[PDB]
Design an enzyme around this catalytic site. Structure first.
Site, PDB file in Angstrom:
ATOM      1  N   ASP C 347       0.857  -1.175   0.000  1.00 22.05           N
ATOM      2  CA  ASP C 347       0.000   0.000   0.000  1.00 22.05           C
ATOM      3  C   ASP C 347       0.897   1.230   0.000  1.00 22.05           C
ATOM      4  OD1 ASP C 347      -2.643   1.331   0.235  1.00 22.05           O
ATOM      5  OD2 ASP C 347      -1.990   1.847   2.250  1.00 22.05           O
ATOM      6  N   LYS C 458      -7.491  32.838  -6.851  1.00 19.61           N
ATOM      7  CA  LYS C 458      -6.276  32.014  -6.891  1.00 19.61           C
ATOM      8  C   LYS C 458      -5.075  32.682  -6.210  1.00 19.61           C
ATOM      9  CE  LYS C 458      -9.039  29.475  -9.027  1.00 19.61           C
ATOM     10  NZ  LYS C 458      -9.687  30.702  -9.577  1.00 19.61           N
ATOM     11  N   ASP C 688      -1.785  -0.302   6.302  1.00 19.15           N
ATOM     12  CA  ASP C 688      -1.927   0.546   7.477  1.00 19.15           C
ATOM     13  C   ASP C 688      -3.383   0.824   7.835  1.00 19.15           C
ATOM     14  OD1 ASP C 688      -2.138   2.325   5.137  1.00 19.15           O
ATOM     15  OD2 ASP C 688      -2.058   3.962   6.580  1.00 19.15           O
ATOM     16  N   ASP C 692      -7.330  -1.656   3.630  1.00 19.76           N
ATOM     17  CA  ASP C 692      -6.494  -2.796   3.303  1.00 19.76           C
ATOM     18  C   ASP C 692      -6.842  -4.027   4.116  1.00 19.76           C
ATOM     19  OD1 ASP C 692      -4.942  -0.862   1.771  1.00 19.76           O
ATOM     20  OD2 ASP C 692      -4.073  -0.297   3.701  1.00 19.76           O
TER      21      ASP C 692
HETATM   22 MG   LIG Z   1      -2.920   3.727   3.621  1.00 21.86          MG
END
Ligand SMILES: [Mg+2]
Ligand SMILES: CCCCCCCCCCCCCCCCCC(=O)OC[C@H](COP(=O)([O-])OCC[N+](C)(C)C)OC(=O)CCCCCCCCCCCCCCCCC
Ligand SMILES: CC(C)CCC[C@H](C)[C@H]1CC[C@H]2[C@H]3CC=C4C[C@@H](OC(=O)CCC(=O)O)CC[C@@]4(C)[C@@H]3CC[C@@]12C
Ligand SMILES: CC(C)CCC[C@H](C)[C@H]1CC[C@H]2[C@H]3CC=C4C[C@@H](OC(=O)CCC(=O)O)CC[C@@]4(C)[C@@H]3CC[C@@]12C
Ligand SMILES: CC(C)CCC[C@H](C)[C@H]1CC[C@H]2[C@H]3CC=C4C[C@@H](OC(=O)CCC(=O)O)CC[C@@]4(C)[C@@H]3CC[C@@]12C
Ligand SMILES: CC(C)CCC[C@H](C)[C@H]1CC[C@H]2[C@H]3CC=C4C[C@@H](OC(=O)CCC(=O)O)CC[C@@]4(C)[C@@H]3CC[C@@]12C
Ligand SMILES: CC(C)CCC[C@H](C)[C@H]1CC[C@H]2[C@H]3CC=C4C[C@@H](OC(=O)CCC(=O)O)CC[C@]4(C)[C@@H]3CC[C@@]12C
Ligand SMILES: CC(C)CCC[C@H](C)[C@H]1CC[C@H]2[C@H]3CC=C4C[C@@H](OC(=O)CCC(=O)O)CC[C@]4(C)[C@@H]3CC[C@@]12C
Ligand SMILES: *[C@@H]1O[C@H](CO)[C@@H](O[C@@H]2O[C@H](CO)[C@@H](O)[C@H](O)[C@H]2NC(C)=O)[C@H](O)[C@H]1NC(C)=O
Ligand SMILES: *[C@@H]1O[C@H](CO)[C@@H](O)[C@H](O)[C@H]1NC(C)=O
Ligand SMILES: [K+]
Ligand SMILES: [K+]
Ligand SMILES: [K+]
Lengths: 33, 294, 994
Positions: C347, C458, C688, C692
């Site tokens: 990841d 901007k 983490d 995942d």
């Molecule tokens: Mg991550």
């Protein structure tokens, strides 16, 4: 006397060896800390 | 699969994953390896056997007091038979007949081997040393007639047909062993019998207190007058220096047993050399159970 | 089936609707919500808004399943036959002989103890749904009966109206209808902490990318919003992720498949020897008691009784070794798995990057300066000497709305929390670490009039008083997007001097801007002006709605760029993993520009190797006119995974070597892990976050990040990196490959001694010889003297450099193969058996039984009632007199096996190298060598051991009968390793190398 064998001498020597070898092997294992 | 892929995959001509030469080479390796191991084993066995003396064993501490045995070789120290039934005591009489074969006088008539020993129990016979330094030794001969009323020169059933059975007691052969009978203080052994300085004494009594009043009369037969082993025969020299050695026997007959009762009887030798044991129930002593059914 | 349905995209078609279709599909009048007569009825109709844990098997079923594990079956059979022998023994005649009762009790206890050992090794059923049950709030905020009330969040129905404020968690999935710009945090789906502005309008066909869907387990952190519920409980997107990740099975570890292969082999050989020699004991007409005693003795001699406990202890020692390197190992069998891995699916955000936006590069004075992006300041700095550095330090420190928190100064600069946004705190931390404190400068330059970033102009601007000798008396400073900043500037700053504007610097400016934008980095430009005193006096104030200060600031200070940088250890670790043969694949929820830039930075995509689009841009070709087999790197967008077939994914994984996936769903990382696993691979997955957590559950080993990791991923993982050091991964590979090589040796040490344990019982029935070895003294070999020397082999070092080897094949390349079996059983075990048979013959010859005389003596020797057995010298023996000699032979056979295992321990340390090259630098090996002999001499010479174990004292010259056989074992294995070393591919290496 051929019909007699002294087993206490061999027994004591074996036990002395069994103590010494164990203390020596543990001193080898615990070298530093 | 397990049908055609692993056994006999034949696109590379392989049986269980190996070709023909790959089988031959590993089989040649294994027969050569096991041949060399067999050679090393036989060689080390021969070098060990070169240290063995063929006249006397290296150690004799595990047979150091001998054992006492009785000749009808029974199965749980039991003797059980009916005297008016000649099939129940057949194995007993046949075993006694097969043992006393070599004690007949037609088997001891060589004179370069056997020799007429004394007729009174005597001192042990030292024939030299254990070293072939004098070749084959001679043997004192044992007359069967000394086992009277329990030999075969009479009734041929050894008493089993007429009630009263009889056993033949012998001591285990130990090479170089000389039994020492108990010394006179007129007290030492137990309880009282006829002391001879050349007889190892043997007594057969009842085991419990309830068997002492049921065993009846006991008769001993042997060489001499006092019941035991005469010491003339006793420095045994081995089956290399003394084949056809005849050990002395002692016959014991129980003439007045009570019927329909399993009676327990202990027989025991006494000496300075004879030791006993609580683990070995045959060392210097034995037990027997006799039942006469009627 | 149903979890096969769970691996699909989420279908809404709610966000495509308008305010009228929602008025009749859910019946909710969009201003007042729902009455409780309808809500409490739909609650009973549909289901509560909650998740529910799966069915969990209790602990005693999982423990009592370990009591039938292959070797335990043969030992339960042995323990049953021991009681059968005791009952047929002591209930017919012999009221002694309680020997066969204690043997059965010992064999029954050995199964229980080794089941405890194999239970500790088991893979530790954890609680993912319980950490999914903590991201749900306790109170909702519903609008019912025309008004608002705060109910429990478990009592929300499908259809009512929720109002969310900044700070809440979101109770369900909301199709939103009114919001004045609240920003949610969608890190549970995409793994990104950058907030998204939610709005009531439809923006994108994919419902995960649209602006009008708020999601479960996330948090709207600004503004306010009103939404209508579309999903509750198990039907939400994150609820389906939780269902998938708690419904994904464990899977068999590769080390467990190696154990359940030699359990099969050894059980096959043991069953064959047990049932082929039991019917020989019936052909030759034994009795049933002797037949079952022979069966017991042949079963105990065949099972390596202490072997599985040895494997458990060795794995525990390796896991405790890894725990001192801040690498916590939860499931023990995952110690081995990191060595045999072949594919790492990593990841990006939080794992490879630092998950903190920080300043990467600057463009002072027509030159590009690079900064140090490292968390421990391992690199070197850029510039602190020129005048424009102090000028831009002033500028970036003063045009900044961010500020520090409430006095956490003892914790250092790069980890202090801030109060403003992250993009401006990236400037703030660089100014703070490289030019001292910023509060001193912010107080000495007093602020007179400001206006922050307006989203259609901007830039962001302010006016500050200069208190020193330069004195422009209210200088100007602003910052903004680079092209609109150099729209309105004409004076340039070079080393503190003013020069005019020529395109000599301007095409260099766009060169630097294009090169910085080619790094995937966010660039913005900064400006200031020394205001004069013709229109602008002291004490004058400007107003924020008109133009009375110049918006034509001819400024040019410089460009500053930001990135999420790689960690300190990842660029070396990825190269170390690639040099060992591991294929590293990037899988992320981020956009492909930042993903491909990070993947080139960390080294997943190497130099020279470039994609299909780089070819078509380098050669000015349409991308459908270039062969896709030309390039060896690919960047696959996640929306093109959706229409992909399962065998086109195999083509992508098959033909490329450097793969990057981007905009990945939580479900699609599972598809990628299964696609790598399908073509025979061992797949590690590092992660983490919660997005995942399915892929961490499917993988062979899941590694979670310790400090920066979510609580969900730390429950779905097999390893936790307790200090976020990614280069521990490489270390976990190395000791993964070493323990697999140290196990073989120990297994070989435990198999060889089986052979001088089986062959005493075979020659007993072939040759009719008195029995050379008992069952108790077999148990004392393995359960005693063999445990410590086998466990000591797990401390051996590597012989070669093991990170130059490729990963092991799972299908070939077994732990125990035919060559370890051939070497242990066929070669060293036979020498170990001849060494014991020689010692057996020595003692009987020295007590008067010559070796030719012992053949056929078995029946008379075993007879309890023959008390005159003639020896070779003519002496006659009682029954208990010769059994003592037999038990002396048993004790000496035990001593001989101990003596040959010295040389067996010395030859089993190395497999190719010598003992004179590796050395004897292993102290626990020498401790095992000493303590094995100490235990043997203690067992032989202790008083009382003739009753408890039937062991007898040895005469002193009987200790030396097995020395030539140990010497033969030693010289034979040294010669074998010499032929292996000098002929590196020959016949001896093909036959005897494990
Ligand atoms: Mg991550
Ligand atoms: C106290 C004694 C200590 C030393 C004793 C150990 C001696 C034997 C060394 C131990 C391992 C066995 C090696 C012997 C066979 C090696 C043959 C060889 O060199 O291979 C190359 C030869 C040549 O092949 P190659 O080496 O070139 O390999 C082919 C592939 N290329 C060409 C690439 C190299 O191997 C063969 O061709 C066939 C070998 C099979 C031979 C059949 C069995 C031979 C019998 C020998 C048994 C010896 C054991 C005796 C038991 C000792 C008792 C303890
Ligand atoms: C040769 C290398 C491999 C080292 C050998 C290691 C063995 C453990 C050695 C160490 C000392 C040896 C023996 C030396 C003498 C004693 C006699 C014995 O004790 C006695 O008999 C003492 C009484 C007496 O000798 O009079 C106990 C075991 C034994 C055989 C020792 C057992 C262990 C031996 C074979
Ligand atoms: C790995 C396993 C299969 C090997 C173990 C099997 C043993 C080698 C067997 C084979 C036959 C057994 C023995 C049978 C009797 C012989 C007699 C002996 O030869 C003699 O009798 C010498 C007499 C003389 O000097 O004339 C050779 C070895 C020996 C002890 C054998 C030693 C080895 C035994 C125990
Ligand atoms: C019953 C007896 C006859 C058999 C016992 C076998 C011993 C295990 C032998 C095998 C080879 C012998 C030794 C030969 C020389 C080496 C040198 C030594 O090498 C070093 O440590 C040097 C440092 C290095 O090379 O890295 C490793 C152990 C040792 C002592 C060996 C240890 C084991 C010895 C005593
Ligand atoms: C070919 C290789 C494998 C072995 C050949 C060399 C060995 C050193 C030989 C020399 C003499 C042999 C043995 C001769 C005697 C035996 C039994 C024992 O010694 C005795 O024989 C004393 C018995 C007695 O006094 O009657 C202990 C040493 C041992 C094992 C010796 C071990 C070494 C043997 C095998
Ligand atoms: C590869 C290894 C593990 C297997 C080969 C070892 C064999 C067990 C060896 C050891 C001793 C050898 C033999 C040596 C000669 C004898 C004589 C043979 O015939 C006799 O009994 C002697 C004649 C008689 O008195 O009747 C009995 C087996 C035999 C012991 C042995 C059988 C086993 C042999 C072939
Ligand atoms: C003596 C008692 C205690 C059993 C121990 C003896 C060994 C198990 C024997 C049995 C037959 C021998 C070998 C006979 C030939 C084969 C060829 C070879 O097998 C293969 O590799 C072919 C299949 C493949 O390569 O895929 C290696 C093992 C081996 C089985 C055997 C290994 C075991 C040997 C040494
Ligand atoms: C040995 O057996 C014979 C049987 O022939 C016994 O001799 C008989 O003994 C009784 C009792 O003394 C006498 O009445 C008989 O006259 C004897 N017969 C003969 C032929 O002598 C003899 O007593 C036994 N020996 C013992 C018991 O020591
Ligand atoms: C057996 O007979 C003898 C003959 O004298 C006698 O003394 C003895 O008391 C008898 N024993 C029993 C038990 O009747
Ligand atoms: K075993
Ligand atoms: K896992
Ligand atoms: K074993």
């Amino acid at each position: 006397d051929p019909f007699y064998y002294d087993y206490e001498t061999v027994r004591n020597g074996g036990l002395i060896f069994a103590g010494l070898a164990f203390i020596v092997g543990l001193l080898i294992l615990l070298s530093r800390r | 699969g397990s049908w055609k892929k692993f056994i006999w995959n034949s696109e590379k001509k392989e049986f269980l994953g190996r070709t023909g030469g790959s089988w031959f080479k590993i089989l040649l390796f294994y027969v050569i390896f096991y041949g060399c191991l067999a050679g090393i084993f036989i060689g080390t066995i021969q070098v060990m056997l070169l240290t063995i003396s063929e006249f006397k064993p290296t150690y004799q501490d595990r047979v150091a007091p001998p054992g006492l045995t009785q000749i009808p070789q029974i199965q749980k120290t039991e003797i059980s038979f009916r005297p008016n039934d000649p099939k129940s005591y057949e194995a007993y009489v046949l075993n006694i007949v097969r043992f006393l074969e070599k004690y007949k006088d037609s088997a001891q008539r060589d004179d370069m081997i056997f020799e007429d020993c004394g007729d009174v129990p005597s001192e042990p016979k030292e024939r030299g040393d254990f070293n072939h330094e004098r070749g084959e030794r001679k043997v004192c001969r044992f007359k069967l007639e000394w086992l009277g009323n329990c030999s075969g020169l009479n009734d041929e059933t050894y008493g089993y047909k007429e009630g009263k059975p009889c056993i033949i007691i012998k001591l285990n052969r130990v090479l170089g062993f000389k039994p020492k009978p108990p010394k006179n203080e007129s007290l030492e052994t137990y309880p009282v019998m006829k002391y001879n300085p050349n007889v190892l004494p043997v007594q057969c009594t009842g085991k419990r207190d309830e068997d002492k009043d049921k065993v009846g009369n006991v008769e001993y037969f042997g060489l001499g007058n006092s019941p035991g082993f005469p010491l003339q025969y006793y420095p045994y020299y081995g089956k290399l220096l003394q084949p056809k050695y005849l050990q002395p026997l002692l016959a014991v007959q129980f003439t007045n047993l009570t019927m329909d009762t399993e009676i327990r009887i202990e027989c025991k030798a006494y000496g300075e050399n004879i030791g006993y044991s609580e683990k070995d129930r045959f060392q210097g002593r034995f037990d027997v159970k006799i039942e006469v059914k009627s | 089936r149903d979890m096969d349905e769970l691996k699909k995209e989420v279908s809404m078609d709610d966000h495509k609707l308008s305010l009228d279709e929602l008025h009749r599909k859910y019946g909710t009048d969009l201003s007042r919500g729902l009455t409780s007569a309808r809500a409490a009825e739909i609650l009973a109709r549909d289901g509560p808004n909650a998740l529910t844990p799966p069915p969990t098997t209790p602990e005693w079923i999982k423990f009592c399943r370990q009591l039938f594990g292959g070797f335990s079956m043969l030992l339960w059979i042995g323990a049953i036959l021991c009681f059968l022998a005791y009952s047929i023994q002591a209930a017919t005649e012999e009221e002694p002989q309680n020997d066969n009762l204690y043997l059965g009790v010992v064999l029954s206890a050995v199964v229980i103890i080794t089941g405890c050992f194999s239970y500790y090794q088991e893979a530790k059923s954890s609680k993912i749904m319980e950490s999914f049950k903590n991201m749900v709030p306790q109170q909702a905020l519903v609008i019912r009966n025309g008004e608002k009330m705060s109910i429990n969040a478990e009592e929300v129905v499908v259809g009512d109206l929720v109002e969310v404020k900044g700070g809440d968690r979101i109770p369900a999935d909301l199709r939103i209808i009114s919001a004045n710009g609240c920003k949610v945090d969608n890190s549970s789906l995409t793994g990104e902490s950058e907030p998204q502005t939610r709005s009531p309008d439809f923006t994108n066909e994919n419902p995960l990318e649209t602006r009008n869907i708020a999601f479960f387990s996330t948090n709207c952190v600004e503004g306010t919003a009103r939404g209508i519920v579309v999903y509750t409980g198990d039907r939400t997107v994150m609820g389906r992720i939780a269902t998938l990740a708690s419904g994904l099975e464990g899977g068999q570890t590769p080390i467990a498949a190696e154990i359940e292969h030699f359990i099969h082999i050894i059980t096959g050989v043991a069953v064959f020897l047990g049932v082929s020699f039991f019917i020989l004991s019936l052909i030759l007409e034994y009795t049933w008691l002797e037949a079952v005693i022979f069966l017991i003795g042949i079963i105990v001699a065949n099972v390596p009784e202490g072997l599985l406990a040895t494997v458990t202890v060795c794995l525990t020692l390796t896991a405790k070794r890894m725990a001192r390197k801040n690498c916590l190992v939860k499931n023990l069998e995952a110690v081995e798995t990191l060595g045999s891995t072949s594919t790492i699916c990593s990841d990006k955000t939080g794992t490879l990057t630092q998950n903190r936006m920080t300043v990467a590069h600057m463009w002072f004075d027509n030159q590009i300066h690079e900064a140090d992006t490292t968390e421990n300041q391992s690199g070197v700095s850029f510039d602190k000497t020129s005048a424009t550095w102090l000028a831009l330090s002033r500028i970036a420190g003063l045009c900044n709305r961010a500020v520090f928190q409430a006095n956490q100064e003892n914790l250092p600069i790069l980890k202090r929390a801030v109060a403003g946004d992250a993009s401006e705190s990236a400037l703030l931390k660089c100014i703070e670490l490289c030019c001292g404190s910023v509060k001193e400068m912010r107080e000495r330059y007093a602020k007179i009039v400001e206006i922050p970033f307006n989203s259609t102009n901007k830039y962001q601007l302010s006016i500050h008083k200069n208190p020193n000798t330069s004195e422009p008396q209210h200088l100007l400073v602003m910052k903004g997007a680079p092209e609109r900043i150099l729209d309105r500037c004409s004076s340039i700053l070079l080393h503190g001097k003013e020069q005019p504007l020529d395109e000599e610097l301007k095409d260099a400016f766009q060169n630097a801007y294009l090169e910085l934008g080619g790094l995937g980095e966010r660039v913005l430009g900064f400006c200031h002006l020394f205001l004069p005193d013709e229109q602008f006096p002291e004490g004058f104030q400007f107003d924020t709605d008109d133009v009375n200060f110049p918006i034509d600031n001819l400024c040019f200070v410089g460009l500053i760029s930001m990135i999420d940088p790689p960690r300190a250890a990842v660029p070396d670790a990825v190269g170390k993993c690639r040099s060992a043969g591991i294929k590293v694949i990037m899988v992320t929820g981020d956009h492909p520009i930042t993903a491909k830039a990070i993947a080139k930075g960390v080294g997943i995509i190497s130099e020279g190797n470039e994609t299909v689009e780089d070819i078509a841009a380098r050669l000015n070709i349409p991308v459908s006119q270039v062969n896709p087999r030309d390039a060896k790197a690919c960047v696959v967008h996640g929306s093109d995974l959706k229409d992909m077939t399962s065998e086109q994914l195999d083509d992508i994984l098959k033909y490329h070597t450097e793969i990057v996936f981007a905009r990945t769903s939580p479900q699609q990382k599972l598809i990628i892990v299964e696609g790598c696993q399908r073509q025979g691979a061992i797949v590690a997955v590092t992660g983490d976050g919660v997005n995942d957590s399915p892929a961490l559950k499917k993988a062979d080993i899941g590694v979670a990040m310790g400090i920066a990791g979510s609580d969900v991923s730390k429950q779905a993982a097999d390893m936790i990196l307790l200090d976020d050091n990614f280069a521990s991964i490489v270390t976990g590979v190395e000791e993964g490959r070493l323990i697999f090589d140290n196990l073989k040796k120990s297994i070989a040490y435990t198999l060889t001694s089986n052979i001088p344990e089986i062959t005493p019982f075979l020659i007993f029935i072939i040759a009719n010889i008195p029995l050379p070895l008992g069952t108790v003294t077999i148990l004392c070999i393995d359960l005693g003297t063999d445990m410590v020397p086998a466990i000591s082999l797990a401390y051996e070092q590597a012989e070669s450099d093991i990170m130059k080897r490729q990963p092991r094949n799972p299908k070939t390349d077994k732990l125990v193969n035919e060559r370890l079996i051939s070497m242990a059983y066929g070669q060293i075990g036979m020498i170990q058996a001849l060494g014991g048979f020689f010692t057996y013959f020595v003692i009987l010859a020295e007590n008067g039984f010559l070796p030719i005389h012992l053949l056929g003596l078995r029946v008379d020797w075993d007879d309890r009632w023959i008390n005159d057995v003639e020896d070779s010298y003519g002496q006659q023996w009682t029954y208990e007199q010769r059994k003592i000699v037999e038990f002396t032979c048993h004790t000496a056979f035990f001593v001989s096996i101990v003596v040959v295992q010295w040389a067996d321990l010395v030859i089993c340390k190395t497999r190719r190298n010598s003992v004179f090259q590796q050395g004897m630098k292993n102290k626990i090996l020498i401790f095992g060598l000493f303590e094995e002999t100490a235990l043997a001499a203690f067992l032989s010479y202790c008083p009382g051991m003739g009753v408890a174990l039937r062991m007898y004292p040895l005469k002193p010259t009987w200790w030396f009968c097995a020395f030539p056989y140990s010497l033969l074992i030693f010289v034979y294995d040294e010669v074998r390793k010499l032929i292996i070393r000098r002929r590196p591919g020959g016949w001896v290496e093909k036959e005897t190398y494990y």
